Write a protein that binds this ligand. Sequence first.
Ligand code: HEM
Ligand SMILES: N[C@@H](Cc1c[nH]c2ccccc12)C(=O)O
Ligand SMILES: [C-]#N
Length: 381
Amino acid sequence: SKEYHIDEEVGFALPNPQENLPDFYNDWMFIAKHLPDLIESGQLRERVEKLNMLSIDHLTDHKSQRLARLVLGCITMAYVWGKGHGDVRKVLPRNIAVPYCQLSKKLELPPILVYADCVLANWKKKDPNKPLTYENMDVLFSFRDGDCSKGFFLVHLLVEIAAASAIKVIPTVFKAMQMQERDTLLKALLEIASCLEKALQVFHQIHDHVNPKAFFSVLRIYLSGWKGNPQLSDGLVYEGFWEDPKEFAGGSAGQSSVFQCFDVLLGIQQTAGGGHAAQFLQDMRRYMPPAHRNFLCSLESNPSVREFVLSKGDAGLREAYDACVKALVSLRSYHLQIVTKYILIPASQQPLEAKGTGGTDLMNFLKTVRSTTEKSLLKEG
Ligand code: HEM
Ligand SMILES: N[C@@H](Cc1c[nH]c2ccccc12)C(=O)O
Ligand SMILES: [C-]#N
């Protein structure tokens, strides 16, 4: 997975990303590192507006370009939403928007904060000699003081890392199929099941580091976007770059390649059907980095693991396949419990159906997606 850019240890996450840019972009780095203070003051909007258009040509390598997207992404969100109380801006300055739109065109991403920015690239190791764990880790950027953005983003990253153990087994599954190696295929599927079972235990940790009320009222508005959002109904206008206001979906873990990776592997056709959920999951691949878009493409091109397993009249092999599907159902069942605690209950406390940051009708969306996953269970062969 050299051309796919999937690490053995961290999977789809960017391994050890850059913390600081070259000196030419210190105007950017100063605004982004002090977003908690500059928003609370009410002087962030002016600070962005009175700032020269710095060009993008001095960002040499990929990790520099990704850190720039993160800086420019976080800044763009804090500008548009401002204090987050309702006073918004429907126009992004030409000095910030043009180089952001150019950098985003270079990396084949939309010019808006995505999962790849604020999770996969928004982290660091405290002590490099220690292991990957919450006490040894910290994010690079936050929005406000008491938004739980450290706990929020790192819990996602921890799941991505847990999934990396499963992702690295996928080449063995296809080799074992081509080579008609039944026992290897069985062991590989049981390993993937075990890794995805373990990723559920990493999910549990979100309660310890993320407060529901701090999440729903403070952080969630900055993660929101402008695709079918009433606050910016026709979209946001990027001054100088584009002519009309352009709609782009807000960030969400739907932009993660992990869950899509295993749905495709296991023949769970989420993106098939032409419904609103299928449409969303396919549309969110635009918001994944192009190497992972390519990985998911490569995965669909391979022979079906499901078809292979069903054809063989083999209880152990079916059971192993079923365990992977059960694991994905569990994670989604637990994800709905999280959604009850972190969206549903908090929204009932503030003074027809509820919209997610990605733009989905979330309760129907999520239960459709879970139901599709449930239907793929063999139910004792
Ligand atoms: C406070 C925590 C969380 C909330 C409130 C939440 C909420 C949601 C919502 C509303 C959606 C629907 C898409 C949208 O409209 O944006 C969604 C989708 C999704 N979420 Fe989360 N989520 C949370 C944490 C997580 C975590 C930790 C993961 C870890 C992998 C995750 C994985 C997903 C995935 C993969 C989808 C796409 C649908 C699917 O494949 O089942 N979410 N989430
Ligand atoms: N989609 C979630 C927000 C969210 C959850 N996990 C994320 C990861 C990255 C960006 C946004 C998110 C919501 O509507 O509340
Ligand atoms: C979760 N989006």
